[PDB]
Design a protein around this motif. Structure first.
Motif, PDB file in Angstrom:
ATOM      1  N   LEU A  13       0.801  -1.219   0.000  1.00 16.77           N
ATOM      2  CA  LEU A  13       0.000   0.000   0.000  1.00 16.77           C
ATOM      3  C   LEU A  13       0.821   1.251   0.000  1.00 16.77           C
ATOM      4  N   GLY A  14       2.109   1.090  -0.152  1.00 16.02           N
ATOM      5  CA  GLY A  14       2.953   2.295  -0.227  1.00 16.02           C
ATOM      6  C   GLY A  14       3.932   2.346   0.917  1.00 16.02           C
ATOM      7  N   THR A  15       4.642   3.462   1.000  1.00 11.78           N
ATOM      8  CA  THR A  15       5.680   3.664   2.024  1.00 11.78           C
ATOM      9  C   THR A  15       5.414   4.991   2.720  1.00 11.78           C
ATOM     10  N   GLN A  17       6.726   7.245   6.611  1.00  6.91           N
ATOM     11  CA  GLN A  17       7.924   7.624   7.386  1.00  6.91           C
ATOM     12  C   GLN A  17       8.593   6.435   8.044  1.00  6.91           C
ATOM     13  N   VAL A  21       3.976  -0.360   4.121  1.00  8.70           N
ATOM     14  CA  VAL A  21       2.683  -0.697   4.692  1.00  8.70           C
ATOM     15  C   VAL A  21       2.029  -1.651   3.728  1.00  8.70           C
ATOM     16  N   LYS A  35       1.674  -1.871   9.157  1.00 13.03           N
ATOM     17  CA  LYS A  35       2.943  -1.148   9.018  1.00 13.03           C
ATOM     18  C   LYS A  35       4.057  -2.002   9.429  1.00 13.03           C
ATOM     19  N   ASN A  84      -9.690   3.460  -0.044  1.00 14.94           N
ATOM     20  CA  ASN A  84      -9.413   4.492  -1.015  1.00 14.94           C
ATOM     21  C   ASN A  84      -8.143   5.265  -0.726  1.00 14.94           C
ATOM     22  N   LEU A 147       2.044   9.912  16.138  1.00 17.91           N
ATOM     23  CA  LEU A 147       3.200   9.104  15.828  1.00 17.91           C
ATOM     24  C   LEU A 147       4.475   9.949  15.500  1.00 17.91           C
ATOM     25  N   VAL A 151       9.410   9.564  15.597  1.00 25.64           N
ATOM     26  CA  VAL A 151      10.202   9.570  14.385  1.00 25.64           C
ATOM     27  C   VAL A 151      11.677   9.915  14.699  1.00 25.64           C
ATOM     28  N   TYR A 156      12.772  15.274   9.488  1.00 29.76           N
ATOM     29  CA  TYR A 156      11.322  15.403   9.801  1.00 29.76           C
ATOM     30  C   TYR A 156      11.079  16.166  11.072  1.00 29.76           C
TER      31      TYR A 156
HETATM   32  C1  LIG Z   1      -4.251   2.171   7.138  1.00 31.89           C
HETATM   33  N1  LIG Z   1      -3.707   2.401   5.784  1.00 31.89           N
HETATM   34  N2  LIG Z   1      -2.467   2.953   5.703  1.00 31.89           N
HETATM   35  C2  LIG Z   1      -1.991   3.319   4.531  1.00 31.89           C
HETATM   36  C3  LIG Z   1      -0.675   3.900   4.450  1.00 31.89           C
HETATM   37  C4  LIG Z   1       0.202   3.425   3.487  1.00 31.89           C
HETATM   38  C5  LIG Z   1       1.465   3.945   3.326  1.00 31.89           C
HETATM   39  C6  LIG Z   1       1.842   4.946   4.238  1.00 31.89           C
HETATM   40  C7  LIG Z   1       0.997   5.373   5.180  1.00 31.89           C
HETATM   41  N3  LIG Z   1       1.513   6.405   6.059  1.00 31.89           N
HETATM   42  N4  LIG Z   1       1.030   7.715   5.759  1.00 31.89           N
HETATM   43  C8  LIG Z   1       1.359   8.702   6.558  1.00 31.89           C
HETATM   44  C9  LIG Z   1       2.218   8.485   7.698  1.00 31.89           C
HETATM   45  C10 LIG Z   1       2.625   9.579   8.510  1.00 31.89           C
HETATM   46  C11 LIG Z   1       3.449   9.361   9.612  1.00 31.89           C
HETATM   47  C12 LIG Z   1       3.928  10.572  10.412  1.00 31.89           C
HETATM   48  C13 LIG Z   1       4.824  10.134  11.570  1.00 31.89           C
HETATM   49  C14 LIG Z   1       4.809  11.439   9.460  1.00 31.89           C
HETATM   50  C15 LIG Z   1       2.757  11.416  10.867  1.00 31.89           C
HETATM   51  C16 LIG Z   1       3.806   8.080   9.968  1.00 31.89           C
HETATM   52  C17 LIG Z   1       3.437   7.035   9.195  1.00 31.89           C
HETATM   53  F1  LIG Z   1       3.777   5.757   9.596  1.00 31.89           F
HETATM   54  C18 LIG Z   1       2.668   7.188   8.013  1.00 31.89           C
HETATM   55  C19 LIG Z   1       2.275   6.035   7.142  1.00 31.89           C
HETATM   56  O1  LIG Z   1       2.627   4.867   7.327  1.00 31.89           O
HETATM   57  C20 LIG Z   1      -0.290   4.924   5.357  1.00 31.89           C
HETATM   58  C21 LIG Z   1      -1.144   5.602   6.323  1.00 31.89           C
HETATM   59  O2  LIG Z   1      -0.783   5.234   7.660  1.00 31.89           O
HETATM   60  C22 LIG Z   1      -2.748   3.079   3.328  1.00 31.89           C
HETATM   61  C23 LIG Z   1      -3.937   2.490   3.414  1.00 31.89           C
HETATM   62  N5  LIG Z   1      -4.809   2.175   2.346  1.00 31.89           N
HETATM   63  C24 LIG Z   1      -4.561   2.249   0.992  1.00 31.89           C
HETATM   64  C25 LIG Z   1      -5.612   1.772   0.134  1.00 31.89           C
HETATM   65  C26 LIG Z   1      -5.386   1.882  -1.231  1.00 31.89           C
HETATM   66  C27 LIG Z   1      -4.202   2.404  -1.707  1.00 31.89           C
HETATM   67  C28 LIG Z   1      -3.980   2.463  -3.167  1.00 31.89           C
HETATM   68  O3  LIG Z   1      -2.997   1.932  -3.611  1.00 31.89           O
HETATM   69  N6  LIG Z   1      -4.892   3.017  -3.965  1.00 31.89           N
HETATM   70  C29 LIG Z   1      -4.639   2.994  -5.446  1.00 31.89           C
HETATM   71  C30 LIG Z   1      -5.180   4.300  -6.041  1.00 31.89           C
HETATM   72  O4  LIG Z   1      -6.564   4.462  -5.660  1.00 31.89           O
HETATM   73  C31 LIG Z   1      -6.621   4.882  -4.285  1.00 31.89           C
HETATM   74  C32 LIG Z   1      -6.141   3.674  -3.474  1.00 31.89           C
HETATM   75  C33 LIG Z   1      -3.236   2.800  -0.764  1.00 31.89           C
HETATM   76  N7  LIG Z   1      -3.448   2.704   0.531  1.00 31.89           N
HETATM   77  C34 LIG Z   1      -4.502   2.127   4.671  1.00 31.89           C
HETATM   78  O5  LIG Z   1      -5.592   1.609   4.809  1.00 31.89           O
END
Ligand SMILES: Cn1nc(-c2cccc(-n3ncc4cc(C(C)(C)C)cc(F)c4c3=O)c2CO)cc(Nc2ccc(C(=O)N3CCOCC3)cn2)c1=O
Length: 263
Positions: A13-15, A17, A21, A35, A84, A147, A151, A156
């Motif tokens: 689901l991406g990366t 900090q 994930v 995570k 989403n 969170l 860090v 950051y």
């Molecule tokens: C619960 N959860 N979590 C993340 C997620 C993923 C990566 C990173 C982060 N993230 N963001 C911010 C952050 C900030 C900090 C501080 C310390 C800087 C505040 C610390 C951190 F750990 C983080 C952190 O990990 C999150 C959110 O937690 C993503 C989720 N869902 C999806 C669903 C679909 C798609 C997708 O691919 N698509 C395709 C296109 O159409 C739309 C959907 C992507 N993700 C999700 O449910």
């Protein structure tokens, strides 16, 4: 404490900090996001102790923490899955063709979450559209609240670092490190600006350093086209130079509900 035997790891689901994930399932039944905390990225022992308090934060507009895996490394953080993804990218997709009532409802979702955090005396410290998520029903929920305290990356955590949320921070944070409730209020006003601008970068033609100057001198983000005068008054009220003259989240919520009724 979740047993990692009860997790699967299905799609990235991406990366963020703290690294990668993943989407997976818990107990062969429940969607979750997991995570996987990268080595060196987190003050792990402090987080583990705080996770105990964070397990008790529960609100329908806050991403729900399901548990942690801490008898291993990397540690895992297991939450509610938000189909989403992040609000910032969702706002930027023109196909959604949002009505302004839908934009105001996203502001209201976040404001409800923030009023709950404020009632618990719990700061987010990095409220922004990138740190909100959207579920399969289009509901916005606040993510990653608190969170920032764990860090390890100086880029950051330093207020002149390259990753510090300069454009979401009030003057007293940038100049003095004065964090309060009122610093989350300022960020919420910037987040309403992001929503009404369909995800533009605040201060879009300025650097971070120029932004910090602009705002210390009293200048403010312009009204997005989609924002009525009443909506602009709400976001603008979050940016008073005197922190104590900014509203609370309870007051913002009442203001948003009034405008919803008006519009
Ligand atoms: C619960 N959860 N979590 C993340 C997620 C993923 C990566 C990173 C982060 N993230 N963001 C911010 C952050 C900030 C900090 C501080 C310390 C800087 C505040 C610390 C951190 F750990 C983080 C952190 O990990 C999150 C959110 O937690 C993503 C989720 N869902 C999806 C669903 C679909 C798609 C997708 O691919 N698509 C395709 C296109 O159409 C739309 C959907 C992507 N993700 C999700 O449910």
């Amino acid at each position: 404490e979740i047993d990692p035997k009860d997790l699967t790891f299905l799609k990235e689901l991406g990366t963020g900090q703290f690294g990668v994930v993943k989407y997976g399932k818990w107990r062969g039944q429940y969607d979750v996001a997991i995570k996987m905390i990268k080595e060196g990225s987190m003050s792990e022992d402090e987080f583990i102790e705080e996770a105990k308090v964070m397990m008790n934060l529960s609100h329908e507009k806050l991403v729900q923490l399901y548990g942690v895996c801490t008898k291993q490394r990397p540690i895992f953080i297991i939450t509610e899955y938000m189909a989403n993804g992040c609000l910032l990218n969702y706002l930027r997709e023109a196909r959604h063709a949002f009505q302004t009532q839908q934009l105001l409802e996203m502001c209201k979702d976040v404001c409800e979450a923030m009023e709950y955090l404020e009632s618990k005396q719990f700061l987010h410290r990095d409220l922004a559209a990138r740190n909100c998520l959207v579920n399969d029903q289009g509901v916005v929920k606040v993510s990653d609240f608190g969170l920032s305290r764990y860090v390890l990356d100086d880029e950051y955590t330093s207020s002149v670092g390259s990753k510090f949320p300069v454009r979401w921070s009030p003057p007293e944070v940038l100049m003095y490190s004065k964090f309060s409730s009122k610093s989350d209020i300022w960020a919420f006003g910037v987040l309403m600006w992001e929503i009404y601008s369909l995800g533009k970068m605040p201060y879009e033609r300025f650097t971070n350093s120029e932004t910090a100057e602009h705002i210390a001198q009293g200048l403010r983000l312009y009204r997005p086209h989609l924002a009525s005068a009443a909506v602009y008054t709400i976001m603008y009220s979050c940016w008073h130079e005197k922190a104590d003259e900014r509203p609370t989240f309870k007051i913002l919520l009442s203001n948003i509900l009034d405008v919803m009724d008006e519009e």
